């Protein structure tokens, strides 16, 4: 059901079953599939393709030539009714592609809120993007990739399959990420190696002097101490006792399966 306050341009095609919310904009030459849901104030500028079982939140700006909810590029996929979820206030730029998940991997590609997906950023099947993340021009996420909150992926950077980008991380431009990246760190190169802590980002987002200094100690324990991960895991866990921001490390370790970048 289409709300009586939403604008559907006479040239745009919206299939029956597609529920469009109040004050939404469906621009010219847009295609909205029968299983698609579009929320309040969400704008599809023009030439936008949204299909499949796709749920889209409120106040989103989806630009021209973007393809959302489309069939993924996994050879195993055979046409199963999988899902796509996008949050609120996301700025999805031109030629951006967000694909549906696969049955083998969970059946869901998930995108959070307040993110900026710059021109030709790709989000593959079964990916999970958090909140306020930035993917620059040509940033490619391979299958099953987690991008946690406030993480920034620079231009022409392919994050390899199954890899997890931690919270508040900044992967530099032209990088190749082959393994898991712990929260708060800078990653550059191909393959990507660590280059200290994102000291600027944490200062801008309002982290206290104690927290930033404690995070750097956790970084020193992980990369600079000379011990293995099993030895520094419980030492970080008790450093997190005083500083709740260091808990992001221990939570991340439980999810990490590809190992850390070194």
């Amino acid at each position: 059901m289409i709300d009586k306050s939403a604008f559907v341009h006479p040239t745009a095609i919206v299939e029956e079953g597609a529920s469009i919310g109040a004050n939404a904009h469906i621009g010219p030459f847009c295609i909205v599939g029968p299983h698609v849901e579009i929320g309040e104030g969400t704008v599809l500028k023009s030439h936008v393709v949204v299909n499949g079982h796709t749920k889209i939140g409120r106040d989103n700006e989806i630009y021209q030539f973007a393809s959302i909810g489309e069939v993924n590029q996994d050879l195993k996929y055979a046409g199963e009714p999988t899902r796509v979820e996008i949050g609120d206030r996301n700025r999805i730029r031109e030629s951006v592609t967000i694909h549906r998940g696969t049955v083998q991997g969970g059946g869901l590609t998930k995108v959070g809120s307040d993110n900026l997906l710059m021109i030709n950023a790709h989000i593959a099947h079964d990916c999970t993007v958090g909140n306020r993340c930035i993917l620059a021009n040509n940033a490619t996420l391979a299958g099953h990739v987690s991008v946690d909150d406030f993480a920034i992926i620079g231009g022409m950077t392919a994050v390899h399959q199954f890899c997890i980008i931690g919270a508040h991380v900044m992967v530099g431009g032209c990088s190749g990420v082959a393994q898991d990246v712990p929260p708060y760190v800078i990653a550059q190169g191909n393959h990507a190696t660590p280059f200290g802590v994102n000291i600027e980002g944490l200062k801008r987002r309002g982290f206290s002097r104690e927290a930033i200094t404690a995070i750097r100690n956790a970084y020193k324990l992980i990369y600079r101490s000379g011990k293995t991960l099993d030895e520094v895991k419980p030492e970080i866990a008790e450093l997190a006792e005083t500083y709740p921001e260091v808990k992001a490390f221990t939570d991340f370790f439980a999810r990490s399966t590809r190992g850390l970048i070194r």
Copy 2:
């Protein structure tokens, strides 16, 4: 002539002379030029541009914002009626570009069958792509490039002009291929260097233990022996006497003009 069982969406524009086959799908906002030929069961999802002298086979899936048969990016080209040929069951993804050839280079850009051209894969003028090849996201083929059967080109990989990618080759992601790549080998880096034989790929495609071991001996002769190519050419030629799979090397050598990656 359009077959009476093909679907042409009322918003799509098909020029007169364009021959569309039985049970083909021409989605909304698609443009099909007067010299275009589209075969049985071929689907153009939507927003697809097919122009020029372009021959397209059967059961193809061409996705949104793809541009096929278009004028190429060679400065020498002046508008000559050149050709494009695409085989069967090819999955041509979003924003993919396949261009027409040039008079100077043969006048034909050729694509085989059962290939997967992932998002924004570029096929330039006078290129020749074989069967069951895979070009990942942003994989760019420069002019006059041959990609032989079963070859895989990873994400954001530019194969330089005139270069030949052998059969069953796997060029890794973010690579730069400046020279010819012999069949069966793994290529990584920029510029791309060899990293052994694609042992996994050959096992999956059904090569015998003898053949894989013989191919590795041919690799050892080429890269690990310490002799030049002229010395190992006839030694490979008589190794191919027992093992027909090694003939792929000697056939490749006759076509190679840029030299091998080392």
Copy 3:
């Protein structure tokens, strides 16, 4: 006002206020905003989006899925009426994006004449592209970037923000340009380092033997002499006294703010 000799395809949408010149082509499914100006003989093939305060010259060929004059990707931008200017005879290929400037940076994105912007070349806010420049497939210009005349930027090359690419420069493929690049030089790698003078380019464009030899002496003064820039600045300035082509260096030095590539 639309000229009575221009072709506006019945499916294309042109807003009121948009001034289209004589013998211009507005192809099917094109969108032209109310503040857009299109000159004589300019062709928009199809599926082209031109919006914002955008001035476009004569004899341009803008291909399918190109987005010109669009809102930029700067987080500071809030919707200010900024400007885009494109010159004459430019070949703007598929999926190319040229954005509007920002108030903070000057309010203007400027593109010269006779340029070739190959598939998916990005021109960000406040950029300045000169004449007869070439940006290959996936070449990304970040914000506030100057590209001087006859400069060539290869495939998948991100020129970082504020950087200046000198006249007659050739940045190779897959490169990362983090600093200013002096006129006449070859740049390769990531980050990009200098590799001599573009000797071929200068010979093709008609530079005299004396001028090319003098430019190479200026290169030798800058990179090979063993002195700092402040010591070689006035020595170049008096070398330019005899050879007017060396003046391009001293003019460039006044504009350079990020330092030279070394």
